[PDB]
Amino acid sequence: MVPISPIETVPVKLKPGMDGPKVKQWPLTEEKIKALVEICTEMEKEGKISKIGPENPYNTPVFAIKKKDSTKWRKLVDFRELNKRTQDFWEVQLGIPHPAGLKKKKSVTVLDVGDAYFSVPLDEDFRKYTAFTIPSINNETPGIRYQYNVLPQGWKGSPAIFQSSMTKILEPFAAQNPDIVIYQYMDDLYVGSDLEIGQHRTKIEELRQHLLRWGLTTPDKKHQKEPPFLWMGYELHPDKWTVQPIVLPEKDSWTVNDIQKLVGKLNWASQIYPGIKVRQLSKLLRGTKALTEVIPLTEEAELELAENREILKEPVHGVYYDPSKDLIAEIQKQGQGQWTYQIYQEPFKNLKTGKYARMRGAHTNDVKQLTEAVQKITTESIVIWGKTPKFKLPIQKETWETWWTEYWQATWIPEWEFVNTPPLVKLWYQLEKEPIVGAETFYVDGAANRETKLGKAGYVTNKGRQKVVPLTNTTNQKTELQAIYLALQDSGLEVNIVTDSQYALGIIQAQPDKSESELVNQIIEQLIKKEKVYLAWVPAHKGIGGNEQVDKLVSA
């Protein structure tokens, strides 16, 4: 015998207050029982499970299933109840690597470690909770009782415990061989390197020898699995990567389900196919949530779809990460709240692409959206590469300086340079910091009856210009904006506007360039046409002439 090192068990507990499962084993056909007895006899000989006495009070149901197109049976132990009762574990499989963060490798070898998985020992004190029962022929003897000695397939803790155990075994090999990478996925180890090929295979043999110390055997035959690897919806090649084939179906009519699937594919595709858009197609999923409902595609959605088909006409690949070079991220505005981006190191060789969509909200502007997109790409890049890329943005340096210095919030974007690629993000208006000499002063107000929704909006000016308009289906807040609109509409190129509307100020001080409100949009269009606008706020009902005059006019 060659001594092997035992794998240390991970101590396991049920959730506080909970006991183990006690679930009835339902009858099986005579055929299934003979099959299970045979299966379990082999497992028992291999040390995976053990017969137990009548004292153990727990139970998990066992089943026998036909794979398909065979005479063979397989055992299935249904651990659903035990899983509900088993403690949570640390899950490492959360956060899978992005292909764009990987490094190119000359060689990648796959090693089968299937013998390891079904051979990690289970915490002795926990084994009792895994008890199951093969029913007896004709139910005339006690059913055969077994419990697990190893991590059972389908039990809550098996993946975490297998991963942690394998990692611990591999750790010294990885540490003392910094010229290879090792990655564990399901049943296999993947080993990559840039070594001269003879040296690479030597490393593989050394790894096999290392694993042998725990009794882990790997098949003598060299793996059939070789690059390219189909993995987590990607294709990995030695020196490039892509998403698995994206094929958009032809359909004469589309349902909720079809569109959700369309968008999923588009979203998946957008990490390497530049320019993918999903705004119009996503709009069709607004509300709804009735799966079989057919929705007509708007002309807009049709155009978006056709634009995507073109983008997806031929394969595109990303390159891997070279740590010795800067990462560069470039962003374009696409319209309707949509932004697209590319991250590269060498010109014309993307590591990945992506998109960002405007957050829901009544009012917004391009600079805020660009800023949000920058933060999102920054955070993604920290995840993937551990560093912020240098940005190329379609906004002039002077425009940014004016924006951030005058904006009421703190705001920042990291190191960036202007790229002159239309459409450029710009400031559409900026309000005056001081009242304008020689500009007419409009005192505005509005009011509405909250019952009838009848209102009035209007203004009076220092030149005696006046206007009041009677309105239906309005509200006090809406009349306040309506009044400001009228003052903008009726004034010359420079204008001072005095309002008591905290609501209106709150919106305008937010500097929107676009809004869901047609009225706010019209106000924005008016501001864009002015040379100078000063907006002054006063408290309501304070005897502030101009303001009180117009408040009275618009009241009733």
Long-range contacts of 406-409 (CB under 8 A, 24+ apart): 406/430, 407/511, 408/509
Q: The tokens of 514 are what? A: 């676009």
The reply on whether position 536 binds other proteins by CB under 8 A is yes
For residue 301, the minimal CB distance to other proteins (Å) is 29
CB 162 within 8 A of CB 150: no
Print the binding letters for residues 433-452 with other proteins: x by CB under 8 A, - otherwise: --xxx-xxx-x---------
Sheet strands side by side (includes 107-112): 107-112, 188-193, 180-185
Print the binding letters for residues 465-494 with ligand 1FF: x by CB under 6 A, - otherwise: ----x------------x--xx--------
Q: H helices of 110-255, where?
A: 114-117, 158-175, 197-212
For residue 29, the minimal CB distance to other proteins (Å) is 39
How many CB atoms are closer than 10 A to CB 62?
Answer: 22
Which of ligand 1FF, other proteins, Mg ion, none lies near 445, with the C-beta cut-off 5 to 8 A by kind? Mg ion
Q: What are phi and psi of 311, to 5 degrees?
A: -60, -35
The reply on whether position 445 binds Mg ion by CB under 5 A is yes
Query: Could you say which of 256, 295, 454, 519 contacts ligand 1FF (CB under 6 A)?
Result: 519
Q: The tokens of 278 are what? A: 């999903």
Applying CB under 6 A, the residues found at the interface with ligand T27 are: 97, 102-105, 108, 181, 183, 185, 190, 192, 227-229, 231, 236-238
Q: Which residue, 192 or 455, is less far from ligand 1FF as judged by CB?
A: 455
Print the binding letters for residues 394-433 with Mg ion: x by CB under 5 A, - otherwise: ----------------------------------------
Q: Is 239 annotated as a binding residue?
A: no
Q: Is 115 annotated as a binding residue?
A: no
For residue 446, the minimal CB distance to ligand 1FF (Å) is 9
The reply on whether position 480 binds Mg ion by CB under 5 A is no
Query: Interacting stretch for other proteins, rule CB under 8 A, among 21-29, 53-61, 325-333, 458-466?
Result: 458-466
Q: How many residues make contact with other proteins (CB under 8 A)?
A: 75
Question: Looking at this protein, which amino acid is placed at residue 348?
Answer: F
Which of ligand 1FF, Mg ion, ligand T27, none lies near 522, with the C-beta cut-off 5 to 8 A by kind? ligand 1FF
CB 100 within 8 A of CB 321: yes
Q: What are phi and psi of 355, to 5 degrees?
A: -140, 165
The three-class DSSP label of residue 79 is coil
Q: The tokens of 341 are what? A: 């981006």
The Cα–Cα gap between 523 and 236 comes to 52
For residue 460, the minimal CB distance to ligand 1FF (Å) is 16
Residues in the chain: 556
What angle is formed at CA 112 by the lines to CA 110 and CA 118, rounded to 5 degrees? 150
The reply on whether position 120 binds other proteins by CB under 8 A is no
> In Å, what is the CA distance from 30 to each residue of 37, 121, 135, 136, 553?
11, 32, 9, 9, 93
Q: Which residue, 163 or 517, is less far from ligand T27 as judged by CB?
A: 163
Q: Is 112 annotated as a binding residue?
A: yes
Print the binding letters for residues 14-33 with other proteins: x by CB under 8 A, - otherwise: --------------------
The Cα–Cα gap between 469 and 479 comes to 10
Q: Is 88 annotated as a binding residue?
A: no
Residues of the binding site for Mg(2+): 112, 187-188, 445, 480, 500, 551
Binding site for ligand 1FF (CB under 6 A): 457, 469, 482, 485-486, 518-519, 522
